[PDB]
Design a protein around this ligand. Structure first.
Ligand SMILES: Nc1ncnc2c1ncn2[C@@H]1O[C@H](COP(=O)(O)OP(=O)(O)O)[C@@H](O)[C@H]1O
Ligand SMILES: [Cl-]
Ligand SMILES: [Cl-]
Ligand SMILES: [Cl-]
Ligand SMILES: [Cl-]
Ligand SMILES: [Cl-]
Ligand SMILES: [Cl-]
Ligand SMILES: [Mg+2]
Ligand SMILES: [Mg+2]
Ligand SMILES: [Mg+2]
Ligand SMILES: [Mg+2]
Ligand SMILES: [Mg+2]
Ligand SMILES: [Mg+2]
Ligand SMILES: [Mg+2]
Length: 1288
């Protein structure tokens, strides 16, 4: 029995959970203790759960809560032995696990559960340790920024203390004069300048009353660099001359020059451009039926950063970087839908233990920030965690490491990224009539949509918190709103970000020309102790603010309750330009201000600065040889394979991904840009690419900015766009403002792109952001040390795509071919600030640059001509690592060799191979060489174009210069060297057995890559005679909160002839839908409940513990002809419903992958013989499918049960390796399932559950790789057509 004790006015139940760490993780902890000379004999860990109860549980309810808290892999249980150390979230914080677990308990009828929380009990046997050594063990077992260690289970009562509300505090300006403001500036950390204090002193002296702490804090956050963008609005004097434009006005110059296709710039928290008229697919409000709505799907774009918080706590730093940016996209106009993301990281050197590289030197770091390696281990996991649980694919990115002592603009100093760049961005779609914000009527209701707040954000104040499923529930309300078209009730919406409601609400009513009257105690709160300052100014996540007409509140409440999206009306818009915040608890008014006070500011800044310019130093080549440089450059993280950043993030949710990072049958992550379809019924789409080249700014500020723009365009150039004016840019500027030379260099770089290169090319920059404190200082010896970033412009390019099918990738063909270099460097072959210089600890002399603007435009326009005429077999641009890395990566992606001659590229073979000038390599059919050279010559490119040679079958990578061999190596050896960084990252972050299997597989050149064998005609629509009758059977497309894959599931059943109906679990609980009216149902994928309490478990136990809904599902599954499919999260849910499903007694559980990591893979499976009616006709076929899950490993009770499942013949799909054999080796089997199993059916074949996603790849265009001869339908369309034909 579980523990039960008094806890304040409540009772606290303590429930023992399952064992918490796998064998490999226990071994790593033992190894770390041994490495610290901590003599630890054994460690075992178990989860422990704490339930704060507001009322007692009866026996039945106690058994339900016990069953809710049974989840996870069935690991080795041990009797507790040794010293207990209980690690929990810090008191005063509430984990996201708690928010979601508590939501499951309430949706299971346990309203007595006020809050659930979890810790980890470690039992350590180490009898000889001293007291100081026990503190070191404790330090090893928790994150000091987020957790605490306790010595008894009962200490967890500290996490549930209820504090009385703290009152507002007055700052006594009337009674003390200006010193009260000086004291408050220090006490509250307002970082006010003297002229900011003068402004506040006069404003309150004029009002004749003391400011409250909340009103000072709100104003300080509104007037910070971060929020007010004073540097980008400043006036400048440079070298003694006043300049005519601010940095923002030079950005806006690009929209004054090129307004084409722009629908919204600089007036929302994303830009919008024109898209394409296509079928937007969603379920109608009245009927619940999914349908296509033919209309423009315009395209929104935004890119943000989260640099400071990621230096302190990288997982939530990066997660809430993604999360914040997703809210900016959904809050565009009057509501919009995010569709695909991008991610970037810049960090200092990794210094992976046991894999030190020769250019890396430990310079030390501040105590209070984490290392570059910790950022790259936990940060990409947090950004992926948000994109995967919210449900947007993450399809392009960058990752740079840089940290070196260099002779730059301010002479010799350390330049790097101890404060990293953490960048998150994406694209979304929006309806034309919702692009413009609406008018806010006087008396509009002012709402906060989203998460109850806590005291987050005000280094503890820099530790963020992410709950992506809350954001998905809010996106579903936003989507119901814009799907109502003219009846959309949102008049105005805005994300909540910096400053919390203290910035978002004043900005909302101000942007509508109104004031606002608000009620503090109507805001939802999970921390009753919070003061009015903490309630109004915290930066809790997953919130939006909205205005809605009072007469639309009943509709808005219906939409929210159906999605389980929390919301509160907290105020009313007023005609008076005033802002007031009242407190019904203290019967007072924490804020009472004219908006022109609140939104008043100090004068415009002037920045008077001078130019600094480094003299470059020629590269010292004494210890450089071509062969050693190839090996070093392939080991630079910036160049090396990025799998560890790619397969951790879904790349298929939505079913609209055409081109992801992984390319070809060997799934090599070298795609130069991302492409999505605009709908599920079109080949129009959208593309995203990134350019960045920060190390060049250590030699030439403007050259680094022009190369960022040029590389974004060379990355996107082999996608079918047409007019260069379709491409729109985000410009994200990271600098150390104030550091010598960086200010004049920022202005020079903004002018270089905004006044010069982008207007000359026809490129708009309609959105951007800036982060202006990119440096770190600490005391290292008893000496001051500093690490300052280069000026770091990241350009993201976004474009409407005219046909996604015509995109080229770096996969070489071995058909008769020609490789052509387009060298936009014009033979300059610069080596300054290249990966070659960096790997020999140098900066060099002169960097690359845009050498000829008309030739850059001509190269783009020539590429677009060649793409549209279908004249290219492959493209890959030149960037980090030069021509050598471009050619190596094309041979990796084509799994072949190259024979290249570089005698035309200069006598300096090192510079010809390793310069990072713009350009790239095209591959064409040999019969088309002369035509393509003439086409390039009509764009002015003839002297830039050079025939290099040919791609050849086999494994030789050969570069010659006339009769001399310059470099020759096995392509497999190069490919494995270029994989060693991801190998080492995966092996320190994930199960090392799996990291090792994936790496070693790359060294087998005989791998034939993904390949297909089909047992049926993929073009035969067996459902066509039924569709032609017009009789369309319904399918219940089942979703729970946190499901994210329902739209494409409905679209696959719709193509097979069904009427797809949106059935939320709330519809079944509210009686709006009854399963008796359906003959088919599908449980869809995603992250219901964030997978807390085990993937699929909350959704299944919600059904089981409501007897009415339980019986509905049992009745459905017991009818004689009904069909059901569960995919991914649906598979997990239905495996937890066995008890309701006949013929399911042998089904396994689905638990954490053996790798211990989310796996987003394009995996090969074979269809096996089973009763499944949904796989009729397909037995023996082998083809790839989208895999995207963290808990897909089949787990049985013991081998008796595996053998029985097998002998009953219910396995319907198995993972196979590329040789065709059933496998458990990773990642060909991505999850470790026994015998490759990844789909099972019932004895009667009418219910099938599977972990992969056929509905993400039912369109050939959405398959990462596929045979060239396939038509619109992939093989997986046959599952949906078999369901239609079976219904008859
Ligand atoms: N941080 C990241 N997250 C996700 N994908 C990434 C990341 N960094 C790089 N990638 C992807 O890895 C591949 C190789 O990246 P990279 O070599 O930096 O591209 P390029 O050199 O073409 O600019 C590309 O498909 C890129 O989108
Ligand atoms: Cl019980
Ligand atoms: Cl990702
Ligand atoms: Cl059945
Ligand atoms: Cl499960
Ligand atoms: Cl088979
Ligand atoms: Cl393909
Ligand atoms: Mg690259
Ligand atoms: Mg590229
Ligand atoms: Mg790049
Ligand atoms: Mg065409
Ligand atoms: Mg119930
Ligand atoms: Mg694979
Ligand atoms: Mg194996």
């Amino acid at each position: 029995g579980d523990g039960l004790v008094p806890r304040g006015s409540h009772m606290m139940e303590i429930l023992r959970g399952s064992p918490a760490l796998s064998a490999f993780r226990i071994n790593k902890l033992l190894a770390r203790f041994q490495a610290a000379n901590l003599q630890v004999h054994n460690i075992y860990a178990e989860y422990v759960h704490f339930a704060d109860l507001n009322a007692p549980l009866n026996d039945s309810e106690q058994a339900q809560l016990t069953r809710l808290l049974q989840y996870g892999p069935a690991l080795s249980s041990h009797t507790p032995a040794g010293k207990l150390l209980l690690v929990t979230p810090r008191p005063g914080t509430i984990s996201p696990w708690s928010s979601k677990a508590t939501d499951i308990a309430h949706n299971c009828g346990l309203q007595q559960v006020d809050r659930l929380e979890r810790g980890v009990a470690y039992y350590i046997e180490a009898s000889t340790l001293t007291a100081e050594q026990w503190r070191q063990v404790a330090a090893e077992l928790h994150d000091r920024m987020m957790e605490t260690v306790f010595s008894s289970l009962t200490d967890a009562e500290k996490l549930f203390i209820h504090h009385q509300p703290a009152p507002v505090s007055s700052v006594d300006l009337l009674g003390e004069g200006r010193q009260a403001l000086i004291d408050a500036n220090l006490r509250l950390g307002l970082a006010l300048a003297e002229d900011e204090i003068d402004y506040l002193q006069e404003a309150f002296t004029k009002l004749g009353r003391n400011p409250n702490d909340i009103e000072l804090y709100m104003w300080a956050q509104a007037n910070s660099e971060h929020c007010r963008h004073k540097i980008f609005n400043a006036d400048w004097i440079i070298d003694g001359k006043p300049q005519p434009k601010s940095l923002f006005k030079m950005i806006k110059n690009t929209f004054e020059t090129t307004p084409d296709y722009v629908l919204s710039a600089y007036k929302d928290n994303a830009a919008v451009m024109e898209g394409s008229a296509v079928g937007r697919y969603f379920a109608d409000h009245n009927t619940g039926r999914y349908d296509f709505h033919q209309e423009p799907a315009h395209i929104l774009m935004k890119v943000e950063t989260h640099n400071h918080p990621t230096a302190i706590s990288p997982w939530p730093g990066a997660a809430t970087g993604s999360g914040g940016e997703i809210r900016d996209e959904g809050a565009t106009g009057r509501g919009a839908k995010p569709k695909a993301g991008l991610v970037g990281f810049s960090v200092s050197n990794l210094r992976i233990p046991g894999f030190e590289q020769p250019w890396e030197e430990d310079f030390g770091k501040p105590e209070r920030i984490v290392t570059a390696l910790d950022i790259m281990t936990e940060g990409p996991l947090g950004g992926a965690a948000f994109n995967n649980e919210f449900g947007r694919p993450a399809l392009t990115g960058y990752f740079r490491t840089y940290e070196e002592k260099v002779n730059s603009h301010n002479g010799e100093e350390l330049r790097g990224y101890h404060k990293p760049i953490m960048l998150a961005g994406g694209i979304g779609n929006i309806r034309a009539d919702h692009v413009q914000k609406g008018e806010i009527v006087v008396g509009a209701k002012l709402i906060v949509l989203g998460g109850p707040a806590m005291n987050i954000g005000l280094d503890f104040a820099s530790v963020q918190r992410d709950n992506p499923e809350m954001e998905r529930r809010c996106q579903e309300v936003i989507d119901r709103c814009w799907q109502l078209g003219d009846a959309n009730p949102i008049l105005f919406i805005h994300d909540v970000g910096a400053g919390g409601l203290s910035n978002a609400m004043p900005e909302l009513v101000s942007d509508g020309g109104r004031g606002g009257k608000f009620e503090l105690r109507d805001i939802l709160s999970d921390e009753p102790g919070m003061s009015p300052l903490e309630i109004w100014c915290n930066e809790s996540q997953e919130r939006y603010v909205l205005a809605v007409a009072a007469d639309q509140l009943p509709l808005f409440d219906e939409l929210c309750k159906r999605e389980r999206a929390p919301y509160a009306v907290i105020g009313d818009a007023t005609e008076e330009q005033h802002l007031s915040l009242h407190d019904n608890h203290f019967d007072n008014q924490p804020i009472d201000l004219p908006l022109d006070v609140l939104l008043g500011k100090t004068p415009k800044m002037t920045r008077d600065v001078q130019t600094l310019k480094a003299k470059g130093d020629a590269l010292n080549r004494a210890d450089i040889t071509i062969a050693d440089a190839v090996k070093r450059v392939l080991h630079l993280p910036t160049v090396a394979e990025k799998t560890f950043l790619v397969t951790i993030g879904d790349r298929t949710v939505t079913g609209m991904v055409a081109r992801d990072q992984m390319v070809g049958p060997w799934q090599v992550p070298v795609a130069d840009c991302a492409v999505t379809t605009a709908s599920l019924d079109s080949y129009y789409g959208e593309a995203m690419s990134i350019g960045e080249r920060a190390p060049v700014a250590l030699l030439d500020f403007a050259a680094s900015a022009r190369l960022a723009v040029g590389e974004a365009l060379t990355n996107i150039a082999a996608t079918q766009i047409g007019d260069i004016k379709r491409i729109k840019l985000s410009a994200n500027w990271m600098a150390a403002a104030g550091h010598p030379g960086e200010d004049a260099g920022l202005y020079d770089a903004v002018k270089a792109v905004g006044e010069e290169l982008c207007p000359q090319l026809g490129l708009t920059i309609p959105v951007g952001k800036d982060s202006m404190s990119m440096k770190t200082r600490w005391q290292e010896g008893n000496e001051q040390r500093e690490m300052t970033s280069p000026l770091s412009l990241v350009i993201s390019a976004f474009a409407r795509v005219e046909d996604v099918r015509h995109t080229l990738t770096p996969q070489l063909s071995t058909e008769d071919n020609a490789l052509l270099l387009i060298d936009l460097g014009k033979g300059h072959n610069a080596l300054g600030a290249t990966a070659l210089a960096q790997v020999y600890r140098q900066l060099g002399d002169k960097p690359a640059d845009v050498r000829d603007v008309a030739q850059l435009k001509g190269f783009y326009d020539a590429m677009q001509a060649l793409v549209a005429a279908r004249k290219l077999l492959a493209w890959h641009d030149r960037s980090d690592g030069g021509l050598l890395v471009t050619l190596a990566e094309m041979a990796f992606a084509g799994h072949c060799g190259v024979q290249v001659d570089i005698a035309a590229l200069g006598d300096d073979h090192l510079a010809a191979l390793f310069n990072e000038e713009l350009g790239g390599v095209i591959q064409v059919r040999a019969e088309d060489r002369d035509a393509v050279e003439a086409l390039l010559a009509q764009y002015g490119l003839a002297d830039c174009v050079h025939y290099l040679g040919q791609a050849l079958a086999g494994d030789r990578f050969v570069i010659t210069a006339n009769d001399q061999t310059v470099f020759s190596e096995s392509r497999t050896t190069l490919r494995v060297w270029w994989a060693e960084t991801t190998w080492q990252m995966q092996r320190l972050r994930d199960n090392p057995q799996c990291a090792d299997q994936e790496h070693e597989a790359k060294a087998n050149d005989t791998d034939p890559g993904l390949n297909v064998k089909l047992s049926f005609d993929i073009n035969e629509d067996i459902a066509a005679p039924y569709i032609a009758t017009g009789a369309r059977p319904k399918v219940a497309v089942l979703r729970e909160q946190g499901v994210n894959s329902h739209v494409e599931m409905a679209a696959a059943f719709h193509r097979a002839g069904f009427d797809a109906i949106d059935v939320h679990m709330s519809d079944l609980l509210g009686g709006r839908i009854g399963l008796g009216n359906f003959h088919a149902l599908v449980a869809c994928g995603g992250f219901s409940y964030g997978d807390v309490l085990g993937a699929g478990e909350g959704w299944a136990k919600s059904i089981l513990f409501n007897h009415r809904v339980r019986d509905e599902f049992e009745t459905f599954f017991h009818r004689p002809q009904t069909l059901a499919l569960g995919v991914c999260n649906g598979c997990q849910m239905m495996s937890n419903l066995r008890e309701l499903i006949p013929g399911s007694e042998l089904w396994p559980r689905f638990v954490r992958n053996h790798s211990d990591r989310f796996e987003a893979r394009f995996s090969l499976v074979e269809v096996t013989q089973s009763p499944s009616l949904l796989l009729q006709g397909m037995v023996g076929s082998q083809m790839p499918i989208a895999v995207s899950h963290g808990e897909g490993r089949v787990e049985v009770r013991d081998d008796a049960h595996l053998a029985a499942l097998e002998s009953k013949g219910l396995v319907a799909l198995r993972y196979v390796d590329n040789f065709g054999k059933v496998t458990e080796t990773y990642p060909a089997n991505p999850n470790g399932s026994p015998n490759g199993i990844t789909a099972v059916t019932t004895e009667n074949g009418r219910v099938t559950i599977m972990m992969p996603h056929p509905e993400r790849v039912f369109r050939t265009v959405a398959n990462s790789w596929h045979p060239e001869n396939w038509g619109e339908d992939s093989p997986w369309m046959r599952i949906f057509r078999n369901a239609r034909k079976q219904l008859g």
